[PDB]
């Protein structure tokens, strides 16, 4: 799977979409994902949560007219979700967080 910071960022910049191993929260839930059980690998082998709208609620990512943001989990293999995320805008700014959205550092 493509699930490292550089891996997913390279792929996002080349193809303007997430790698195939990503599904959104709503698509995982419809597969039977119960997040509190940590069962994503049992209902969606090899998949990671990603692609959902990111609302940037603390406003730490830069805003711009017509720009929206989305997020994906990074370094997830199985079990409960971790603290690492990649954040990519509709005009292909790419940031990362490893502290559960407290801080962001630009990567592309």
């Amino acid at each position: 799977v493509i699930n490292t910071f550089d891996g997913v960022a390279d792929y996002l910049q080349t193809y303007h979409k997430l790698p195939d191993n990503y599904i959104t929260k709503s698509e995982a839930q419809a597969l039977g994902w119960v997040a509190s059980k940590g069962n994503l690998c049992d209902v969606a082998p090899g998949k990671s949560i990603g692609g959902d709208i990111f609302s940037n609620r603390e406003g730490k990512l830069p805003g711009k007219s017509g720009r929206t943001w989305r997020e994906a989990d990074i370094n997830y293999t199985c079990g409960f979700r971790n603290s690492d995320r990649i954040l990519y805008s509709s005009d292909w700014l790419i940031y990362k967080t490893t502290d559960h959205y407290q801080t962001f550092t630009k990567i592309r």
Partner: protein, 90 residues
């Protein structure tokens, strides 16, 4: 089912509010204690069905420089987007 209780008059600060939610909702150790972390917890960590009882909300609003309302709003957005959340303002 899973129930979190907030005694709003015991909230000391916006930080203390996030720390209370982290215990009450059994959030992960890495919980970022911010609004995007809270949203991620409610839509891809927390146990459902979820009941939140927020007592004395107005006190907590004054003890957190108004941050309490933006935290409540995350629950209302998650619910409005289909999350199974019952909210009690007592």
């Amino acid at each position: 089912m899973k129930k979190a209780v907030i005694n709003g008059e015991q909230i000391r600060s916006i930080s203390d509010l996030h720390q209370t939610l982290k215990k009450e909702l059994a959030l992960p150790e890495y919980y970022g204690e911010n609004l995007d972390a809270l949203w991620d917890a409610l839509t891809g960590w927390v146990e459902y069905p979820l009941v939140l009882e927020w007592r004395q909300f107005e006190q907590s609003k004054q003890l957190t420089e108004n941050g309490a309302e933006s935290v409540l709003q995350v629950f209302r957005e998650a619910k409005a987007e289909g999350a199974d959340i019952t909210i009690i303002l007592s």
